[model samples]
Target chain A: GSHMEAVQNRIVEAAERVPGVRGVIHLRARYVGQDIWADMIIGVDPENTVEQAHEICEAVQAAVCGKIRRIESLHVSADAREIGDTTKPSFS
Target chain B: GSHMEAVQNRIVEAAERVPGVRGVIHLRARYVGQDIWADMIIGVDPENTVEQAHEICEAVQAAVCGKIRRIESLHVSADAREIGDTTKPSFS
Candidate 1:
């Protein structure tokens, strides 16, 4: 129930639209003025090659940044399996 | 080049140290406050299955982060490929 909610919605929509991206595993947003420096963990099929995973990650970043004007930076990491659903990385 | 050179050395060293990591194809690093957030593309054999590629990626991240103290975030993507040469002498 905040301004971030609207921004977050757009983030997901743009990311998943890419061809190889399975889903967004995690998202953390930090605001720098009206711009967002976002970090994301996206899921791709474990059946795909690492080259494909890298391309998908690039596509996700491009899609989100191109679709959203307020994105200052977008860092997308790929989790190429179902593990993203069961285990999430710890950030301290 | 000046400040990042040392960090760059450790990045390749740590990632390649892991088994199944063929070599590092690319590396990108940025400053997140005092810590550095790195993105890497490491090569692996194309014969490996997707599940194995994912495992290799995880291992690289684990090794790099454990060895390098200043690396706050290390995102790794696998690059996979192979090619065969076609050269022969023909008489027609």
Candidate 2:
């Protein structure tokens, strides 16, 4: 209890250092209970192929160390990250 | 540090024998950590409907009460598995 860095801090640190890392996305769910957990998708350099993307994942694994669990290959999806916020609707 | 079998065994046994379990992806992270953590992609027996899959998860939960800690049920993926030359890729 006394020894742990705040969970958010730990997550932020890991997200920041992840190689080719982008931003962290906060996840909230009523059904899953209360916990301010977030997951970040590591951004790949355009030149990186699927193999290099795997390497990027390995690098992120190295960066996060003991805090993370079970990461398999990062599934590549085209234009997957570009969803605009429906609420704002082009306001911001 | 003082107690705790080597991490590999802890993970292997955990993943291999999980009921309805298909396989695991072992993650070896260096410059980041020493543990060989894995994520088991649990398999659903063909007869298991969605509701049955949920039931199987609860049953597994009851089975692994003390020996392990927190875990959620599973993920759904279209039938697909083929990673090149992944004959249990060893991080040796």
Candidate 3:
């Protein structure tokens, strides 16, 4: 079924649309002792604000959602909205 | 008029409610090399995602928009959503 492949492909297509998106990474891991799944890591240019990051993530999520209805309930990080451009540890 | 001041305060109040949002910042910028005025900065955790960032941005934007009906022309950046956490020179 294209559900799995379709989901994967939609994500890829969405990632490509993000400006300065160097790459899209998919890593498999076990969540809550459940079956392993892929963690989608989208690489964007540094110096971008948390809002900018959201823009990219929104683009990806929207694109995927618009294309296929198979993936849902995935939580995008809320901490990603920080506006500072510095990459250093903020706790410092 | 309270339009500008109201806009600023609403955004600040909204930022205070976001989780892992370390701080809020407002700046005066020259878009297209014009005079300086009116910008906002919102901070969030590094572990956050682009969708998370949008949540914060949207919150701020929404709060301000709800209170005031203007200032929707702001253009958020796009190159900031890649999933790698190494926040470094995105252009590099």
Best by the DockQ measure: 1
What RMSD does model 2 have?
13.4
Candidate 1 runs further than 4 Å off:
A1-9, A26-41, A51-55, A58-62, A69-77, A83-92, B22-41, B79-92
Order of models, best lDDT first: 1, 3, 2
- Listed per model in order, the count of residue pairs whose N, CA or C atoms clash below 3 Å is 0, 0, 13
Q: lDDT tens digits, residues B1-92, model 2?
A: 42233443444355446565333333221121432222222233433333343344344334433344332321211111233423452321
Point out the worst 10-residue segment of candidate 2 chain A by lDDT. A73-82
Clashing residue pairs in candidate 1 are none
Candidate 3, A1-92: lDDT as tens digits: 54545455555666557664545533111223432222344545444555555566566656655654444423222233223333322100
Tens digits of per-residue lDDT for model 1 on A13-49? 7887898777776666777888887767677788776
Per prediction, fnat is 0.40, 0.00, 0.29
In candidate 2, residue B40 scores what lDDT? Answer: 27
| True lDDT of residue A67, candidate 1 | 91
What interface RMSD does every candidate have? 3.4, 13.7, 10.2
lDDT (Cα atoms) of all candidates against the true structure: 0.71, 0.34, 0.43
**Candidate 3 chain A lDDT trough over 10 residues, lowest sum:** A73-82
Instruction: Using TM-score as the measure, name the better of candidate 1 and candidate 2.
Output: 1
Considering DockQ, which of the candidate structures 2 and 3 is the better prediction for this target?
3
Higher-lDDT candidate of 2 and 3: 3
**lDDT tens digits, residue span A1-92, model 2:** 33223444454456557655443322111112432222233333333333443445456556654464322222211101122422211100
